[PDB]
Amino acid sequence: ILGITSKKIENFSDWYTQVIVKSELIEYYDISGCYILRPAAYYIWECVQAFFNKEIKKLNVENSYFPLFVTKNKLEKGFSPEVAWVTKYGDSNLPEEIAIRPTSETIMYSVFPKWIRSYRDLPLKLNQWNTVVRWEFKQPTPFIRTREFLWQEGHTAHKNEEEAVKLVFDILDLYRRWYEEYLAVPIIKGIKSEGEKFGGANFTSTAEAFISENGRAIQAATSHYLGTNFAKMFKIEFEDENEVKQYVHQTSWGCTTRSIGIMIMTHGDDKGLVLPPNVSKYKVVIVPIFYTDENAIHSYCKDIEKILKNAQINCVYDDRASYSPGYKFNHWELRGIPIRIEVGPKDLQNNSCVIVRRDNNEKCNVKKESVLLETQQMLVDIHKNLFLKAKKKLDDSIVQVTSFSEVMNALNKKKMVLAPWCEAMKPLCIPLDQPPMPPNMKCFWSGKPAKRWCLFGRSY
Template sequence: MAKKLTAQADDFSAWYNEVIAKAELADNAPTRGCMVIRPYGFALWENMVAVLDRMFKETGHVNAYFPLLIPDSFFQKEAEHVEGFSPECAVVTHGGGKKLEESLMVRPTSETIIADMYARWIQSYRDLPLLINQWANVFRWELRPRAFLRTTEFLWQEGHTAHATAAEAEEETLRILDIYRTFAEDYMAIPVLYGPKTDAEKFPGALQTYAIEGMMKDGKALQMGTSHDLGQNFSRAFNIDFQTRDGSREHVYQTSWGMSTRTVGAIIMAHGDDRGLVLPPRLAPHQVVVIPIAKSDEEQAVVQEAVDKLVASLEGVRVKVDDREQFGLGWKFTEWETKGVPLRVELGPRDIASGQAVVVRRDTGEKEFVSLETLGKRVGDLLETVQRDMFQRALDFREARSREIRDREAFVSAANGDGGFIHAHWCGDPACEAAVKDETRNTIRCVPMDWEADSGVCAYCGRASERKVVYAQAY
């Protein structure tokens, strides 16, 4: 293990890779473009899964599971969908030692196979809405993989719903967008911009894609979740129809939405610092690490007893006691800092003698002495404070690196600069959007839907504009 991490300012990308390795979140797999999610990284993901799964269930969704392999012909049924996904699909052509009659696509997403099943399950308006989610792995043969952000195989949830009316489907799409926003802000402690994507950026086969977009510490944008209003595009292609209350037949209106292991990358890049990860308390695998300090065997016994009491006083908190003998204190401090544990509690003979413990915040490095009687309460309060402060810092950071720009020269110069969000008017012409991408590598991340209506002129082409959008370089 190398002694020091590369500083973020020196090489953000190298910093990112080193943090993942040193914090033992993931390791490169022998399989091209794939990663192994290690126990610590998986524990973080599991905490995220638990929260999201609860939120989905609270809003009426149920879980199910569909096959990994999808008949090739299914993809051909929706024109935009096949065009969007074919280039990045892995295909199974042989099975049982023989060439298959029909190739099977390893799912890059499951709209098609789920639509096929929905066509069988839905007969009547009484069968609607159908609100199903699945936790699954998917494959996309990406040309340039990056751990968590873009791996060939990744884990995610994908929700697929069917509704009787367009309005209900739209409402569902926005309900999920709101769940994603809440999850990002309240749990991941990452403020997000949210709203519809432009046509160029929307999901292949969707009428409209909504997304949440967060800012990473290098000023780039990361799409952290998407919610699609599919309209009747798939229900027509797969003939998912139902009988209405008045006896006529109609195709269902669908949505799909997903959030993936990419969000682990978001937590790393939105909060991490030159010492490693900084994890938000609500999702951290260990919220508190306790480090006992003892020289002799006699001290050991006394400290052990105090540690037991201390841990008992932290009921309901995810606590890790690091009593490994083979590592010195400095080693342990550094390791848990690298792993981003929100609070460290040190407990040694000197502390016990004065009836206190040392508590250190990972996010600020602030150290305080807390009496052992009040430690339980203090730790609980501190965890909440850290969670809140992390969100506020991320918000301040984003605001500091966002600016509103109105004229072309400043726009191009800023877009070619060193990252950050640009708030600017856009005429609505896809050609203009494409030209900006060519010239600056910036794309429109979304059209924030909570911004007030405002007319003006397009920052790039000068034509009339009805909307302001967010431009950024994206992962």
């Protein structure tokens, strides 16, 4: 009951449920597919939100808030069974049903024509941090697929294709950094196939992550070039620099709290949650061991707490008298605190302490004067190690194939497949980083000549 009783490989699904609850990330809720985000989970969202905000602001993107509700006729300008409908206020029916936003396309693009008259009004760059609701038919999973989820949705409109297209890939790399620099998760940039892209999009760029334990790919984030599709539909036009009426070129992009789930599944182990330092409130936990003047142990630990905190490194000194040091060890490992500092009589004797990494459980005795410096670079190295170990697993999950039997073998081993492309397992994306393609290569399913490599696999 106390700790994680299932192993990540043996029973991944039950391991996941145990980790997210016992590490105090979420609480389950009496509405299926909805979950309470406890402070530990929301801190992660706050962090990546702060990062993403800073970066998109550099791209002159402005934050805004559009209404949670959209009327029936405006929404209705193959998704409808996912729409949640507000019908009643109190005991009175609404004259017209109103929908809860599943996304803000119809809400925003209905007003864009009013804001866009000439080239002078361009580019228009908007972003929202909000919630949307979708009554997912597929089985709900905490973070990964929820019926209400926090996200960010960006929407832009430009004078031409090139400015729009560049921003699409600018945003896509921000998503890359989002996962890499804060969640320590490696992702693959790519273009969706025509059958997998957002229907309203010209093309859909994507960031894909992969979970080796169940052999499933997860779309980490999206970034669409919408072209003039929505511009035509909503009559979003502007007057040229040459007085000619033109359609705007639009982009849209989004990343949700699914990112947190991807992080958990990536870095979590059999001991429980493992947090990248950049998304953990407490970077260090200080645990005291008695046998010995207790008050002297308190003074030493508090001194180290002051040293770290003064250097703007948030940490916690677990001085709860009712719990053994061993209990505290597991307590904070479970909650994913990157670093544990142990202080006992022996450490107090040499004016030193034991520092313990959460990721590989490596221990080392450091002098009190070197605690700060060693802590700082250890937090750096922990993030590097988490990312690199994760990248190795991602890379080792892809097999380059040129035949059907090679595909069957990879599918049976829960691997992803990199196959020739000439345009349940499905096409995931056409990776931006293309390996060389032999001149006379064919798709083994069509015989047509291959132009690029496509990534295939099962997905969430």
